[PDB]
Amino acid sequence: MRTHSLRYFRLGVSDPIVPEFISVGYVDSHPITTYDSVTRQKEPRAPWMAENLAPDHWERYTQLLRGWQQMFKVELKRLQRHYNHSGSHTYQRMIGCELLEDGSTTGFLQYAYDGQDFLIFNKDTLSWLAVDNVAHTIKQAWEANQHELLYQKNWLEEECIAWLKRFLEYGKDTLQRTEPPLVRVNRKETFPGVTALFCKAHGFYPPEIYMTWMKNGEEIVQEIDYGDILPSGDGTYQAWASIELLYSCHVEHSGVHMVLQV
Amino acid sequence: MIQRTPKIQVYSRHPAENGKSNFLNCYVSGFHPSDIEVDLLKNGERIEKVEHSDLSFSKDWSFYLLYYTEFTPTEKDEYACRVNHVTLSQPKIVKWDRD
Amino acid sequence: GVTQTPKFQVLKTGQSMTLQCAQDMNHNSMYWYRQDPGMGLRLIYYSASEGTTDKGEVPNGYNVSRLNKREFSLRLESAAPSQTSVYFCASSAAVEGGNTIYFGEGSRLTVLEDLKNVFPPEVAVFEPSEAEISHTQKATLVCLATGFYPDHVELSWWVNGKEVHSGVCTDPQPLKEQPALNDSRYALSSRLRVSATFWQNPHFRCQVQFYGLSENDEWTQDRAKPVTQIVSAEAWG
Amino acid sequence: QNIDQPTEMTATEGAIVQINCTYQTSGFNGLFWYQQHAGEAPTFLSYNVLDGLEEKGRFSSFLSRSKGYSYLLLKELQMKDSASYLCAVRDSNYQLIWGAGTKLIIKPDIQNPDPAVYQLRDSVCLFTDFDSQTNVSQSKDSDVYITDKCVLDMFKSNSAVAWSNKSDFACANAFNNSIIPEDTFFP
Ligand SMILES: [Cl-]
Known part of the structure; x- marks a missing residue:
């Protein structure tokens, strides 16, 4: 199995134009759950989530999300008071875990104020890393509750991973599939005497792809331009890499290596 | 407070060929705050049958969205993506490079 | 902490009842539980935060109102004899892991088909045995609270007008005077042991608080209305 | 989903008693121990979510997550320790599942x-x-x-x-x- 991850995001907006609160869950790049302050309901985002979780899951987490929504509103008000900020500001949260290919795990829990790092949980020392003195004030208050830190460590290391394993089974046909890339090299004289080489890949799943340009099989070419890995809209992805010009494009995707000699 | 302007990428689902049915994507990303307006245009006019993903969350606290529509590229048709955000003083029209 | 009312209540089948609960801890989550013999606390309804409530395990026959952040009331629409139980209101800072649950004092509710079997106790004090005094140089007073119904009583010992706890022991549960009957009345005993030198000085009072009927309760029987009352029995040294 | 603890336990004054709690839940988000005196409200004793023994005066709370087991250990038993001891486990959906309780009887x-x-x-x-x-x-x-x-x-x-x-x-x-x-x- 490849590396997989589970994560839950929260967005809180003060004085919005836009919901006051949104929560979205993901398995890798796939949305799995959604909640907002308008619907006040937690709903599946993936048919394999809807098909496999009974209504009591959605009923229970809707109640929790309504409480988390209220807690987010109060916490953003306290942050604004600490910073002496008026107007519309954002509060964000990300919690999740990763199950690596080798069986080892990672877990993370972070907060952001106005889209910047604010508090970073360290589950190995059971402490919060504060970026400034407002975050330090919150860190001191939160660390006073040792039970909650321990609870968060247990959730990140044990509960999150068990949810991830459960969801990966539910979404097996989507998440554990391989759609190999369609790769081509395009050559063109651009500015006189200048040749541009593009290595373009599309139709692949998962989105994680490695592409590079090599010279005489050995050295990586200096000054490679990389294209972002973009969703094609049909569940597959596209990307590219280019160079100015014996050159070859090297592509690695889900245990398969590919060379396109120019 | 740091506001991040959206990255706007317009591209087709498959390699484009004039006359062959395709999908035109507009991927809008790396923006903060979340309020954003996106429209796909055909020769300056808004396309009505336009699908889009829900607002999405990146680990770097910015947001992303995918707007797409079914289309048949032609030599004469000009496609674009029109985006508005608080970081923009006016909507930004990003033309499709025709692949 | 958590304040809930009333401590005791007798209801007739079909009557309405509201249980009040408040907490001054600025807690988001509130709960209503019922405690029944031989089973774990069962959640009736909960309120994860102000502005939301949801069904627990046993919601049928009840409804709740999260009035504000402080208050969460429990309503019995049409009381049934199966709703005879001990009700506990509870609160915690959040429903998530770690957050300590704080319970209210508890509400003992008895639902009856009719109020005709409701009786206050008969209270009698039994003076120490002269054989016990001479054998141990100790003296045990026994107090019996008999024929009460429902089992809504609090027994205490008063020596020279002051409540005592040392040398006192009361049965934790009443016994059934008619074990085979569905509406058996009850009996409770308590003992107060003092030195023989203390019993020989010439007051001891066994006091029983009974929680029965309220002023608003309709009563049409020839016997006195079995209202909430204190029944006591005395002995001098 | 089940929470199991003995119905009743009897030990002697001045001795030690270990009250066991086993749980079978889909997930685990912590385990509580409460003390409830007869006719009184339950009162918090401990919360365990990671592995180990936590000592608070004469009372200790142990947890083994892999074994799905906890115990409440009471040392130097006193008559005032006669009470019911309730364990509760928070499951994967944060539902608190309460055990039926253990009535502890102290023999003087x-x-x-x-x-x-x-x-x-x-x-x-x-x-x-x-x-x-x-x-x-x-x-x-x-x-x-x-x-x-x-x-x-x-x-x-x-x-x-x-x-x-x-x-x-x-x-x-x-x-x-x-x-x-x-x-x-x-x-
Ligand atoms: Cl933020």
Whole structure:
């Protein structure tokens, strides 16, 4: 199995134009759950989530999300008071875990104020890393509750991973599939005497792809331009890499290596 | 407070060929705050049958969205993506490079 | 902490009842539980935060109102004899892991088909045995609270007008005077042991608080209305 | 989903008791221990979510997540420790599942036993000053009432009360359904 991850995001907006609160869950790049302050309901985002979780899951987490929504509103008000900020500001949260290919795990829990790092949980020392003195004030208050830190460590290391394993089974046909890339090299004289080489890949799943340009099989070419890995809209992805010009494009995707000699 | 302007990428689902049915994507990303307006245009006019993903969350606290529509590229048709955000003083029209 | 009312209540089948609960801890989550013999606390309804409530395990026959952040009331629409139980209101800072649950004092509710079997106790004090005094140089007073119904009583010992706890022991549960009957009345005993030198000085009072009927309760029987009352029995040294 | 703890446990004053709690849940988000005195509200004792033993005075709470097991250990047992002990586990959906509870009974250490059946007057029969090993059986006769043994602390002693308004009732025969000490004093 490849590396997989589970994560839950929260967005809180003060004085919005836009919901006051949104929560979205993901398995890798796939949305799995959604909640907002308008619907006040937690709903599946993936048919394999809807098909496999009974209504009591959605009923229970809707109640929790309504409480988390209220807690987010109060916490953003306290942050604004600490910073002496008026107007519309954002509060964000990300919690999740990763199950690596080798069986080892990672877990993370972070907060952001106005889209910047604010508090970073360290589950190995059971402490919060504060970026400034407002975050330090919150860190001191939160660390006073040792039970909650321990609870968060247990959730990140044990509960999150068990949810991830459960969801990966539910979404097996989507998440554990391989759609190999369609790769081509395009050559063109651009500015006189200048040749541009593009290595373009599309139709692949998962989105994680490695592409590079090599010279005489050995050295990586200096000054490679990389294209972002973009969703094609049909569940597959596209990307590219280019160079100015014996050159070859090297592509690695889900245990398969590919060379396109120019 | 740091506001991040959206990255706007317009591209087709498959390699484009004039006359062959395709999908035109507009991927809008790396923006903060979340309020954003996106429209796909055909020769300056808004396309009505336009699908889009829900607002999405990146680990770097910015947001992303995918707007797409079914289309048949032609030599004469000009496609674009029109985006508005608080970081923009006016909507930004990003033309499709025709692949 | 958590304040809930009333401590005791007798209801007739079909009557309405509201249980009040408040907490001054600025807690988001509130709960209503019922405690029944031989089973774990069962959640009736909960309120994860102000502005939301949801069904627990046993919601049928009840409804709740999260009035504000402080208050969460429990309503019995049409009381049934199966709703005879001990009700506990509870609160915690959040429903998530770690957050300590704080319970209210508890509400003992008895639902009856009719109020005709409701009786206050008969209270009698039994003076120490002269054989016990001479054998141990100790003296045990026994107090019996008999024929009460429902089992809504609090027994205490008063020596020279002051409540005592040392040398006192009361049965934790009443016994059934008619074990085979569905509406058996009850009996409770308590003992107060003092030195023989203390019993020989010439007051001891066994006091029983009974929680029965309220002023608003309709009563049409020839016997006195079995209202909430204190029944006591005395002995001098 | 199940939470299992013994119904009742009996130990002696000054000794140690270990109250076990096993849970079978889909997930795990912590385990609570509460103390509940008879006719009182439950009060918090401990919360465990990671592996290990946590000591708080005479009480310790252990947790093994892999074994799905916890124990509440009470040391240097006192009469005031007679109460029900409730364990509760928070499952994967943060639902708190409560155990039926363990009633803990503390047997007092009776230094000078002096078993006797006495007659009191306003009649009542008092079985008292027997050792904690003695058990009091309930009445076979419907119009004869026998209470369970009760411990009072002035010196600590056990006692049970028997009463009736039946003509045939005598203190000599009041506790005939119980196994009483051979040396019981019948004045
Ligand atoms: Cl933010």
